[PDB]
């Protein structure tokens, strides 16, 4: 029952949670925490290339609303947690609380209270904690919330699309109007995996006009840092994306967020440089990208540490 602190990095399938500490040196420590005493639906999965005979399974009913529930409430927030059990194969199980003390909002209870997760069948008698999950579950069944609603719940299953029929047409049809999206993954600083709304397109988006240090089978200078810079700001965040262009299945675009433009930020931090092959498709003024990059180069920041000024 040791309360430890942390910061929500992302929400996983079955409502599992990855928690991190803050940068004290290099990469911040990560912790996958499964929620004890409850069972949430499984998200859609795409078969790994490692297992070629396996195939893509879809969403379980109310699995995606369950993920979205926690994503809206937990992402970027400070939480406290206690580990209840740790299986010999390394998997940790525990309780997650919103706040700084263990009497804050219990995440597991919040899920069950809204019919987004059910109680695990216990053979023994309920502890104090398992009893309230029962109350939350009955209140949810009475109110007919989520999985306790009338019907399949099949409308909560996304028609996930991992490819696009014609990328050029799909991008041009939006006429550079911002698209509601969720940043699901961060490959490196300037390339992300986005879930496009409202038809649930899972696409690869590269930032227009710039390029961050990348990995190739291995990391380049400031690659892991730049990835974290983008991750710590946009991972599983609600954003708007301007579909500016495309090369094959990869979509060139710009990510919009109330806290700022990640493209300008990356440049100003020296985590990225301007590239001329794609700078023409940047619709938010390419001259500002030049200024952001020039700002960093003058101060020899990160990738410009070994920059030699002309003389």
């Amino acid at each position: 029952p040791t309360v430890q602190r942390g910061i929500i990095k992302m929400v996983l399938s079955g409502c599992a949670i990855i928690v991190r500490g803050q940068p004290r040196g290099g990469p911040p420590p990560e912790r996958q925490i499964n929620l004890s005493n409850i069972r949430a639906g499984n998200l859609a999965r795409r078969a790994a290339a490692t297992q070629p005979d396996a195939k893509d399974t879809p969403d379980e009913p109310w699995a995606f609303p369950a993920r979205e529930f926690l994503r809206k409430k937990l992402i970027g927030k400070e939480v406290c947690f206690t580990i209840e059990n740790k299986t010999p194969q390394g998997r940790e199980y525990g309780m997650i609380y919103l706040g700084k003390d263990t009497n804050g909002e219990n995440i597991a209870e919040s899920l069950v209270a809204e019919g987004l997760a059910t109680r695990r069948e216990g053979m023994r008698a309920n502890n104090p904690e398992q009893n309230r999950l029962s109350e939350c579950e009955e209140q949810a069944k009475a109110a007919k919330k989520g999985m306790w609603s009338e019907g399949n719940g099949s409308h909560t299953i996304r028609d996930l699309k991992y490819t696009i029929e014609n990328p050029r047409h799909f991008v041009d049809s939006h006429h550079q109007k911002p698209v509601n999206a969720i940043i699901e993954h961060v490959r490196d600083g300037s390339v992300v995996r986005a879930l496009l709304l409202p038809d649930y397109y899972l696409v690869t988006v590269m930032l227009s006009g710039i390029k961050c240090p990348t990995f190739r089978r291995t990391p380049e200078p400031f690659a892991a840092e730049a990835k974290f810079f983008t991750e710590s700001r946009l991972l599983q965040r609600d954003v708007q994306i301007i579909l500016e262009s495309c090369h094959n299945q990869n979509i060139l675009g710009t990510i919009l967020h109330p806290n700022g433009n990640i493209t300008e930020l990356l440049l100003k931090e020296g985590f990225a440089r301007c590239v001329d092959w794609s700078i023409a498709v940047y619709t938010r003024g390419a001259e500002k990208l030049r200024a952001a990059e020039r700002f960093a180069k003058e101060r020899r920041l990160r990738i410009w540490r070994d920059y030699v000024a002309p003389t």
């Binding site: 803050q22 940068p23 040196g25 290099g26 990469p27 911040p28 994503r71 809206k72 409430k73 992402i75 970027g76 927030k77 400031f222 840092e225 974290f228 810079f229 710590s232 700001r233 946009l234 965040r237 609600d238 967020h257 806290n259 931090e269 990160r302």
Partner: peptide
């Protein structure tokens, strides 16, 4: 200091 976590939180709310 090249591991820059944001001061202000970038939340969905």
């Amino acid at each position: 200091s090249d591991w820059n976590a944001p001061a202000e939180e970038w939340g969905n709310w």
